[PDB]
């Protein structure tokens, strides 16, 4: 029993942490065979940072520009080259600690765990969910730039997240391992604010079968309400919309529990106007958004 | 910037988890140089779980009654003893993989990261902490018995509970590496309950710290309160009383924040007495007491 925010194992991605310097510009880097991943903008010089054009950049540079550091061990460059905000060092050994892994975009509301890296040495793990305006509550301080975000599935590593900067409300943008962004950012060292945000619904309704399975039952009632009139309420206290999809997806905890997904969304209901009166769920205050279905079934019985 | 449940890197602790059988019995076990640790429980049989005698348990058996699992290598016992309630397999293959380790017990209020294991295959890390009462609120299923929580400093690996058993209201209960039960508890499937709990204010000051450190002030006041009018009102919210040594080990806190100790203290009054009325502080709705003074510098 208990439910706690549980992340991946990070052994196997801690493998593969390096860092990776240029200049004297100096980030994390991701090993995987031949290669090292990492945030392009270690390119560039603090005068760079402000406004780049990494193309112009990259050309002026060469293979030995490149230090990249596998705790002690020099690796040596053979190759540069970028894909959209990510650079990659072909360099002349293969990481033997790679591990089977593949690159995978996720989708907001989706969890994945983040290992915090600095200069190359993992220094711890956590849970985070992608937020539906496409950026991450993570926890980063200076020289985090180029961590990672992954999930494991039997023994395989979906890496989905690299670190690039962080937001003036202290949240945190990044890529997938394409080089691809997250939401509506550059990188590029100038003010840029996170969209309007909305709380992932599925999840609460998720985290509160959790918290049937594991013994609070106060939130319960017996009222029921459409989906409709649910979503009504929902948009009033900015909830993201519920599908009939997401009902799917949480059949088989309505089924483990007995209590209709509809039932749940009445005390949701419940719950969001009622406030909780000094009460908890699960340990906590608040309605709890960053609890896939996914994350319920495997950390629940 | 940010504040989360952060845990150690795992990977260290991943590389010596293994799969103990006995009989039917089977459960996770910790194999460093030519040894695995693990709860003696395994040698009970259903039958003897109930009011066993490990003893006499431990006398009937053989090293051949030990079957020890790594991946699809049968590691193969060589010697056996009890360490307590700590069952010691040595075995002929020292673990390539053991770290820098140490066994290290722990006070009531400390945090650790826990590896849930399950048949050997270690499947998930979170951060708990010792409660006041010798329990954890962790997330153990059917199976895990034999994890282990532990910390890391300078890659040497704190190893500092093992758990045991879940208890009637969800709570887990271990020991430390050498067997010895944190808070009153036996190895023995009959209802145990967990005793009084208490909330850590140490801890609490430390969190409100890490506030302040990231930008949130709101819970702040000018009032200010003596260590004793302050230990009266949380008595009374069922909060651990206020030591000299916790005033000090807030003090790296209170001076790259500005806010006196006692400042804290007349903040944590007035947030006992009033509640949060719909507020927050970094991103919670009640008042955390998981983050020791330690965690706080370490993550801000
Ligand atoms: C607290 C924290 C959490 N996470 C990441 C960070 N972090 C960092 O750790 N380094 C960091 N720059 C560096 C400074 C270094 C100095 N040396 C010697 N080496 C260095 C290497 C790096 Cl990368 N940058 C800024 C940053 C990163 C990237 Cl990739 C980018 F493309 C644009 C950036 O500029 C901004 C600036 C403002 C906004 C806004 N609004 C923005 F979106 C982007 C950052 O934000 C900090
Ligand atoms: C959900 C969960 C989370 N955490 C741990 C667990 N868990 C488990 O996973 N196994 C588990 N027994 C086993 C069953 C097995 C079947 N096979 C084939 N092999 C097995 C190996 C084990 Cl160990 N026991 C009970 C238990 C463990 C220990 Cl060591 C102990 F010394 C006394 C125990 O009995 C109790 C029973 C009740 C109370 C009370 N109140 C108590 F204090 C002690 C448990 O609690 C379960």
Known sequence: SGFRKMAFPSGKVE???????????????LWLDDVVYCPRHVICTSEDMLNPNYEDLLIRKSNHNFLV???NVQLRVIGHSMQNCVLKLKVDTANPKTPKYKFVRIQPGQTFSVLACYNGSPSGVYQCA????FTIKGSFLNGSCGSVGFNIDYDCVSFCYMHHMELPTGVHAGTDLEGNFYGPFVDRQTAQAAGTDTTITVNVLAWLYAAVINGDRWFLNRFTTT????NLVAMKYNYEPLTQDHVDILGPLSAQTGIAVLDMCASLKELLQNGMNGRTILGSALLEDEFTPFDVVRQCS
Do not use: I
């Open 227 to 230: 989906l409709n009139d649910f």
């Open 15 to 29: 493998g593969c942490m390096v860092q990776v310097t240029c200049g004297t510009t100096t980030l994390n880097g």
């Open 130 to 133: 992608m937020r539906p305006n």
């Open 69 to 71: 550091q596998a705790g």
